[PDB]
RNA sequence: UUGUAUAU
């Protein structure tokens, strides 16, 4: 299958070995393992003359390196390194294979790649392929990169056919693995039109979503980086549950992200809750310090309350000091302490 | 190494 020269150069014949010495062999050496290397490195620092001869032999079946294990990489480096009409005659070579290459493992990444440098009307035609597949691509290991890409780089305008898929299924794209993250680049990049009724799916199921293997990390996400009114909605579903949701694996983490963004009375409320509240043997801080997950809330609540509450907090671990030592978490409570 | 998620 390979040639005399490509044989030759696995077997170190051509040390010395230039771009312009494999012409007539470019798309054989893009296919193979370091035939594509020697090519990619050669890309970077090679004339715009020799980056044609390069460009003139893979433009025709373009495609087919685009799907190809060691060829994929060859076609990234032009979109990235080549010139804007390389760039350009690279996407028309794709047009009309978005949605087969986008759920492609090797094809994916030079969407991803073609998406970050095309000019707007080129991206847009390439998202207009997408209309009619959102939730397969969503759903799928390659293509729910593609989405996320297409969310980071394209005007959220031509982005509503994503939105308009996801109504009424954020809870269960929230969920999911590959959903739960292109919902959350659908809240750092599109419009307030477009993530409106996203939030209000997502603060109807905040209960569920807390406590799920995906969906917690959606929840932080609003806590970290969402308005004021969204941190609050969210904030009031865990009041009155922070012990509870302090003891669970996924939930314990949204407990913390509540503490950490709340307001200032927001957060004073929830550490007062621990504080006051019993938990059948002593209060809830008792419970929470010796639990696997609620000794990190506590932690946290140590560390951001104010002075005052400090305090309060310091008062209330004071006592069980000592027996803390006879506990696995507890302990860890303790290493705590002593920076203060 | 006291506790959870993305790919050549």
Not at 53 to 80: P, R, S, W
Not at 139 to 167: M, R, T, W, Y
Not at 215 to 237: F, T, W
Request: hydrophobic share 40%; proline share 3%.
């Amino acid at each position: 299958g390979r040639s005399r020269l490509l044989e030759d150069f696995r077997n170190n014949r051509y040390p010395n070995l230039q771009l312009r010495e494999i012409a007539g062999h470019i798309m054989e050496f893009s296919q193979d393992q370091h035939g594509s290397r020697f090519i990619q490195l050669k890309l970077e620092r090679a004339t715009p003359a020799e980056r044609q001869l390069v460009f003139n032999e893979i433009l025709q079946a373009a495609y087919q390196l685009m799907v190809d294990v060691f060829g994929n990489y060859v076609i990234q480096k032009f979109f990235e390194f080549g010139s804007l009409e390389q760039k350009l005659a690279l996407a028309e070579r794709i047009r009309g294979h978005v949605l087969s290459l986008a759920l492609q493992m090797y094809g994916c990444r030079v969407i991803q790649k073609a998406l970050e440098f095309i000019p707007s009307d080129q991206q847009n035609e390439m998202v207009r392929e997408l209309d009619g597949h959102v939730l397969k691509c969503v759903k799928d290991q390659n293509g729910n990169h593609v989405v996320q890409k297409c969310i980071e780089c394209v005007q959220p305008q031509s982005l509503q056919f994503i939105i308009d898929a996801f109504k009424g299924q954020v809870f269960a794209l929230s969920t999911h693995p590959y959903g739960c993250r292109v919902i959350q680049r659908i809240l750092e990049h599109c419009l307030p039109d477009q993530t409106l009724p996203i939030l209000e799916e997502l603060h109807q199921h905040t209960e569920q979503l807390v406590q799920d293997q995906y969906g917690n990390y959606v929840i932080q996400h609003v806590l970290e980086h969402g308005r004021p009114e969204d941190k609050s909605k969210i904030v009031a579903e865990i009041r009155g549950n922070v012990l509870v949701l302090s003891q669970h694996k996924f939930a314990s983490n949204v407990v913390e992200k509540c503490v950490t963004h709340a307001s200032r009375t927001e957060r004073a409320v929830l550490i007062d809750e621990v504080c006051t509240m019993n938990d059948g043997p002593h209060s809830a801080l008792y419970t929470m310090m010796k639990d696997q997950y609620a000794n990190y809330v506590v932690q946290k609540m140590i560390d951001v309350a104010e002075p005052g509450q400090r305090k309060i907090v310091m008062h209330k671990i004071r006592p069980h000091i000592a027996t803390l030592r006879k506990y696995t978490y507890g302990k860890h409570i303790l290493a705590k302490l002593e920076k203060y």
